[PDB]
Amino acid sequence: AAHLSYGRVNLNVLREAVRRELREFLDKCAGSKAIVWDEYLTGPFGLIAQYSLLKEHEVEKMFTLKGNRLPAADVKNIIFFVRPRLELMDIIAENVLSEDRRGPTRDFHILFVPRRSLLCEQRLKDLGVLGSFIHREEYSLDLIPFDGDLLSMESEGAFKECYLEGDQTSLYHAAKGLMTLQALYGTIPQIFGKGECARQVANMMIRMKREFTGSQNSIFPVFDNLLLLDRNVDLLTPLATQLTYEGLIDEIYGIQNSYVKLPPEKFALPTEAKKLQLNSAEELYAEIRDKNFNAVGSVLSKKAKIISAAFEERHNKQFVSQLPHMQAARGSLANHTSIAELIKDVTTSEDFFDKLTVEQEFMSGIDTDKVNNYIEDCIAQKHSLIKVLRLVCLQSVCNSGLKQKVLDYYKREILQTYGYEHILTLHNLEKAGLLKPQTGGRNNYPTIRKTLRLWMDDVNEQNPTDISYVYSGYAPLSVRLAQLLSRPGWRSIEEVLRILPGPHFEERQPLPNRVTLIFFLGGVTFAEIAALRFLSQLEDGGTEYVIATTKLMNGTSWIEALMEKPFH
């Protein structure tokens, strides 16, 4: 996939490597196979291999781990592709013991993704079934390539686990994934971090490299720097409504493993959602994904002319060959013209204007300490709980928590309107720093905002000059910190760093335009990603970013992962 290779970083090396380990493991379970999938893995895996590849290695069937009895199927092998979690082990046992004895015996194998755990195998041994697996194995799929500059773990629970449950299991896998990167792309000489989770990943990287027993890595470093950042250092950014094209698509429809599902009417029973893939392989999408949504119209018009001219030339040799490209480019323009229309419908409603006014009030310091009328109206009209929670948390973070009278008012109305089950929800938002009572000390956020210029009025959305174009005024704190690390360095902002959570550090790993790998521990938004691509294309900025994350998220999916499964 050509799009996985952007400038100096060729992420096919990683993808081709995991695609090879997969083949090799499938060959090891020789004879026909059915894979039983932990549901959560199916989507992410799609980015590594499709069914076409698995068929090549005699995978004749695929089921979802449901439990009870496995469907019959004349295969020699059954292979569980499961995450190392205990709940699932119990379900796996049901399957092994629910074996129909009125058929031929099917051999059982298990593939832990990304790797086994001690606790799990104890569950299987205690349940009896441990001894029934021929091959127990692991498939070290940690960082998944989503695009040429983008990798994700797609580990949804990671934020909740680290910040609420005292569980740093995801950080270990992150460190592991960084080792895999280093083995293919060279050791990363310089490590910088800000955050508690970032300190831990650093420590683990350094220890693991200490503990390495292979032949010597003789690869010239692709990445000059690693920057590890705790999501909880910037809790504001995900709460805000993203205003880039890709961000809006994600906010409204959601993008899952690089695909989106859209109302099908404008495109070409029941009629299934129009399913589209969204990454940089589609030229037009590369040109618009990162733009403020108000800039997209103009690119669309320009594309129309470029297409007409291509046909006008073909009207008056090489054009037989470009024609399959030309047709596809019209189709692409037609697809994104329709999406833009779907999005413009959302973004020109009165409710959207009002929400955005409030968000921008909070982000720029206005009335962050009083009960907000619009939020009250949304509650009274029983708008989506998540939208309400996003706003009350946005308020709380811009204010460093709320006074008692105001926090209590919001909790009582939320509980009364959406139900008392949401007392778990509010407890979690407080433990996570999102919606809390203030201390009655000074609110530090204004100092940070001013000093790092996080809010600016009347920003240019058509030809941006600053990272704030992605939220039409708010410069993501996270990206701003990346920017200032690169120039003029974090010593010039020591006072601000000290009033942000956890330590800031640097470490050096010894070796026999800079590229910086930036790793968001606890999630990253598409808007933040757009802003980092903006930094990478400034001629002056002297740093290009490759973005890594535990999870691609938005404020809606972020807060949902802090709610108790299942929903109402």
CB 518 within 8 Å of CB 483? no
The C-alpha atoms of residue 513 and residue 511 are separated, in whole angstroms, by: 20
Contacts 24+ apart (CB under 8 A), 443-451: 443/399, 443/400, 444/400, 444/499, 445/397, 445/398, 445/399, 445/400, 446/365, 447/496, 447/499, 448/477, 448/496, 448/499, 448/500, 449/364, 449/365, 451/493, 451/495, 451/496
- Minimum separation from the CB atom of position 561 to Cl ion (A): 19
Q: Using CB under 5 A, which of the segments 4-12, 205-213, 245-253, 256-264 binds Cl ion?
A: 245-253
Query: Which is nearer to Cl ion, 355 or 411 (by Cβ)?
Result: 355
Q: What burial class does residue 10 get, using C-beta atoms within 10 Å of its C-beta: 0-12 exposed, 13-18 middle, 19+ buried?
A: middle
Residue 251 or 544: which CB sits closer to Cl ion? Answer: 251
Q: How many residues bind Cl ion (CB under 5 A)?
A: 1
Based on CB atoms, which residue is closest to Cl ion, 163 or 253?
253
Gap between the Cα atoms of 371 and 410, Å rounded: 8
518 bridge partner residues? 227, 547
Query: Does 250 engage in binding with Cl ion (CB under 5 A)?
Result: no
Closer to Cl ion by Cβ: residue 38 or 251: 251
| Minimum CB–partner distance for residue 252 and Cl ion (Å) | 5
**Options 187-195, 244-252, 296-304, 501-509: segment touching Cl ion (CB under 5 A):** 244-252
Choose between 230 and 250: whose C-beta lies nearer to Cl ion.
250
Q: Least distance (Å) from Cl ion to the CB of residue 391? A: 12
Of 216 and 348, CB closest to Cl ion? 348
Cβ-closest position to Cl ion: 251
- Which residue, 330 or 387, is less far from Cl ion as judged by CB? 387
Scanning 227-235, 247-255, 469-477, 507-515 for contacts with Cl ion by CB under 5 A, the matching segment is 247-255
Least separation in angstroms between residue 354's CB and Cl ion is 12
Residue 470: alpha-carbon gap to chain centroid: 17
Interacting stretch for Cl ion, rule CB under 5 A, among 101-109, 251-259, 412-420, 439-447? 251-259
- Select 229 or 240, whichever has its Cβ closest to Cl ion: 240
Alpha carbons 330 and 400: distance in angstroms, whole number: 50
Judged on CB neighbours under 10 Å (0-12, 13-18, 19+), 37 is middle
Smallest distance, Cl ion to C-beta of residue 49, A: 34
The span from the CA of 524 to the CA of 517, in Å, is 14
Measured from the CB of residue 265, what is the shortest distance to Cl ion in angstroms?
20
Closest CB to Cl ion among residues 145, 247: 247
Query: How far apart (Å, rounded) are the C-alpha atoms in residues 554 and 260?
Result: 14
The residue among 111 and 248 lying less far from Cl ion, judged by its C-beta, is 248
Q: Check binding of 359 to Cl ion (CB under 5 A).
A: no
Query: For 474, which DSSP code?
Result: B
Query: Is residue 238 classed exposed, middle or buried when 0-12, 13-18 and 19+ CB atoms within 10 A define those classes?
Result: buried
Give min distance, CB of 275 to Cl ion, in A.
21
Beta-strand pair 77-82/225-230: unpaired
State the nearest-atom distance from the C-beta of 346 to Cl ion, in Å. Answer: 6
CA 307 to mean position of chain CA atoms: 34
Question: Tokens 């895996």 sit at which residue?
Answer: 45
Minimal distance in Å, beta carbon 242 to Cl ion? 9
Q: Which residues contact 491 (CB under 8 A, 6 or more apart)?
A: none
* Cα distance between residue 392 and residue 385, in whole Å: 11
Whichever of 251 and 461 has its CB closer to Cl ion, that residue is: 251
Q: Give me the least distance between CB of 91 and Cl ion, in Å please.
A: 36
Inter-residue contact 395 to 364 (CB < 8 Å): no
- The verdict on 251 binding Cl ion (CB under 5 A) reads yes
- Burial profile 451-484: b = 16 or more Cβ within 10 angstroms, e = fewer: ebebbeeebebeebebbbbbbbbbbbbbbbbbbb
**Least distance in angstroms from the C-beta of 351 to Cl ion:** 9
How large is the angle between the packed helices 350-363 and 373-380, nearest 10 degrees? 140
**To the nearest whole angstrom, how small is the minimum distance from the Cβ of residue 119 to Cl ion?**
41
| Nearer Cβ to Cl ion (156/251) | 251
CA angle 77, 78, 84 (to 5 degrees): 135
Tokens of 178: 């960084």
Applying CB under 5 A, the residues found at the interface with Cl ion are: 251
